[PDB]
Amino acid sequence: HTHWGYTGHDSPESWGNLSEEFRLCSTGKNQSPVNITETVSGKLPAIKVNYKPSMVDVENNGHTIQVNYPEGGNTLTVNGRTYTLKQFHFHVPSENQIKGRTFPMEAHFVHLDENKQPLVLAVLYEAGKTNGRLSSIWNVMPMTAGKVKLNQPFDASTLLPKRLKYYRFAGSLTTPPCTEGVSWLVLKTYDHIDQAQAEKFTRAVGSENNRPVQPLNARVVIE
Amino acid sequence: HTHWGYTGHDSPESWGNLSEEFRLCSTGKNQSPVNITETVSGKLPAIKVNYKPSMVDVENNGHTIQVNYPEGGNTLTVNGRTYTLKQFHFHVPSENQIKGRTFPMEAHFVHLDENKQPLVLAVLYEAGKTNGRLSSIWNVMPMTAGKVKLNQPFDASTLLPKRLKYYRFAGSLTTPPCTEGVSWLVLKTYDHIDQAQAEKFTRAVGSENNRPVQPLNARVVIE
Ligand SMILES: [Zn+2]
Ligand SMILES: [Zn+2]
């Protein structure tokens, strides 16, 4: 596709101008990420997560470190609707902010339902002790653009907190073409990582990979 | 099968995350072993054992030292039903506990009825005099992963106490996939072993091989 990045001439502020296909990045009114400040308290449906030990591959596509799921079986159910986990990746530092706070890292679990409707479940990481559950992925992390098949099974359920309360809002993909119509569920409970793990990620990717926050406009964030 | 153990990243706490087939190890509500503290006094049916000198082979499968029975003929009858002894193995230290007490060793005599329903008869060993009845097995014990044919016939009846009174509860296999629906009969009368016999076992297996005790939950132990 058309080349884009986080630094230089093809930075986020230039995404909508580097290709007609990326126009929504600059003209969209329902863009992600956002800075969650004010919220409307509401009775949100409980999410049911059904992740399991699976055979996955880890790739460095030059924009992030992504863990792919070629086989089905890992799903998230919310309000009677089932979404299949396609992949999960990270951003260092975080893209979304809570009351203006940027976190060391943020993970995005990308799902699709039967009708190709996208849903992103987000996990924020605070600076703290080493994350032992991410060690498997970090150990085989391609330091240059490429894909490697994780030989041992990986269970993404280990990456989710016990309590699944979340913030909900409508948004878009945070990378070109910035497609809208994406459901965003940001978990309110944070996980942790150390400086070394975050630094290694930036090394592999080549730069910080977070898109600046976008205005909420007509949207409200439910909590 | 997927690798699992008692030490490192594949320890008992992570079994349920190693493969989807091991999921019951972490989600099961009727898991073994257990710490027998409170019990209900009941009229339990008598156990009838009909073991005989048989041709067996001793095996070191990396998880325990197991004595395999290629042919039937060694049976245990309780409450009208007959179970055939398939094999017996050991755990050092013991898996099950009696009022918080861990024993130097525990033997598991695994049986299966006509319909493949599992029944485990357990014998606990106290530290004491050398066990002369186990010498035949201990002397040929493979110190590395392998199987050796026992040249002389072995009669498992010599490994059972005179008094066959027992504790009765429903549980599971104490190793992956942690299958439930297993009937557990733990003998009240203990046998003995020397410290040397126990340490030789540990040396052969590579580590202690006892799964931590599990919550009884809705279960009651009868005696
Ligand atoms: Zn992302
Ligand atoms: Zn056992």
Swiss-Prot record, chains A, B:
Gene Ontology, cellular component aspect: periplasmic space
Residues engaged in binding substrate: T174, T175
Cofactor annotation: Zn(2+)
InterPro entries per the UniProt record, alphabetical: Alpha_CA_prokaryot-like (IPR041891), CA_dom (IPR001148), CA_dom_sf (IPR036398), Carbonic_anhydrase_a-class (IPR023561), Carbonic_anhydrase_a-class_CS (IPR018338)
PROSITE patterns: ALPHA_CA_1, ALPHA_CA_2
Keywords: Disulfide bond, Lyase, Metal-binding, Periplasm, Signal, Zinc
Residue ranges of domain Alpha-carbonic anhydrase in the record: 2-223
Principal place of residence: periplasm
Domain of life, per lineage: Bacteria
Cystine residue pairs: C25-C178
Broad enzyme group: lyase
Residues at which Zn(2+) binds: H89, H91, H108
Documented EC number(s): 4.2.1.1
Localization (cell): Periplasm
List of catalytic residues: H63
SMART domains: Carb_anhydrase
Claim: Nuclease is one of the keywords in the record: no
Keyword Lyase carried by entry: yes
Molecular functions per Gene Ontology: carbonate dehydratase activity; zinc ion binding
Catalytic reaction equation(s): hydrogencarbonate + H(+) = CO2 + H2O
Record-linked PANTHER family: CARBONIC ANHYDRASE
Biological role stated in the UniProt entry: Reversible hydration of carbon dioxide.
Family note: Belongs to the alpha-carbonic anhydrase family.
Name of this chain's protein: Carbonic anhydrase
Source species of the chain: Neisseria gonorrhoeae
